[PDB]
Amino acid sequence: LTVISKKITDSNAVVLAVKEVEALLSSIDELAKAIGQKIDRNNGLAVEANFNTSLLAGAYTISTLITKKLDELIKNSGELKGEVEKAKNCSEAFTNKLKEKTQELAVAAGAATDIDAKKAILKTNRDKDLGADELGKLFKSVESLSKAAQEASANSVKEL
C-alpha cells in the first residue's frame, strides 16, 4: 500500500533523527570521562588535572549542534511535535547554563578545574549547578522522545 509504505518511511526518518541526537548526547558522556585526563600510550587515559577549558568548549559546541537537530526535526515530527519541542528547550537550557558559568568553565591558560567541569557535564555528579542538572533533564527528555521507536516499530508491525 502506497500510503502505508509512506508511513513506514516517515516513522523511519524520525527514529533516525532521534538516534543522531542520542549519539551526540553519548559523546558528552565520553567527554566527562576525559575530565582531567590525558591520552596514555599504555592505559588509554592517565591523570593530568585542572586543565579542562577547551574540553568544555567542545561540549559547548556539541550542545549547539544538538539544539540544531532537535529544531530541524520539528517540521518532520508529525504527532511527536510536542515531545520534540520540549526536547529542544531542554537542549537550549543546557547550552545557556554553560554560557552563564564562564567564570568556572572558561578559565584562562586552560585551567578549568575537574571539580567545576563535573558540575557541568557529568550527569551523575552530586553537585549539578554548572549545567549538569540541565544535561540530565535533556537526556531524560530525549529518552522519552525516543518512544518514537515504539511508534515506528508498530507502523511496520501494521502486518495485522
118-124's contacts with Cβ under 8 Å and 24+ in sequence apart are 118/32, 118/35, 120/56, 120/59, 121/28, 121/31, 121/32, 121/35, 121/56, 121/59, 122/32, 122/35, 123/29, 123/32
List the interface residues with its own copies, window 88-147 (CB under 8 A): 98-102, 105-111
- For the bound state, the minimum distance from the C-beta of residue 111 to its own copies, rounded and expressed in Å, comes to 7
Total chain residues near its own copies (CB under 8 A): 59
Grid coordinates given for 132: 549538569
When asked if residue 150 is in the footprint of its own copies (CB under 8 A), the reply is: no
- For the bound state, the minimum distance from the C-beta of residue 37 to its own copies, rounded and expressed in Å, comes to 4
List the interface residues with its own copies, window 27-56 (CB under 8 A): 27, 30-31, 33-41, 44-46, 48, 50-56
Q: Which residues of 128-159 are buried (b: 16+ CB within 10 A; e: fewer)?
A: bebbbbbbbbbbebbeebbebeebbeebeeee
Q: What are phi and psi of 39, to 5 degrees?
A: -60, 145
Binding test (CB under 8 A) with its own copies, winner from 15, 90, 142, 145: 15
Q: Which is nearer to its own copies, 58 or 78 (CB)?
A: 58
Grid coordinates given for 29: 558522556
Q: Which is nearer to its own copies, 9 or 124 (CB)?
A: 9
- For the bound state, the minimum distance from the C-beta of residue 77 to its own copies, rounded and expressed in Å, comes to 17
Binding site for its own copies (CB under 8 A): 2, 5, 8-9, 12, 15-16, 19-24, 26-27, 30-31, 33-41, 44-46, 48, 50-58, 60-62, 64-65, 98-102, 105-111, 156-157, 159
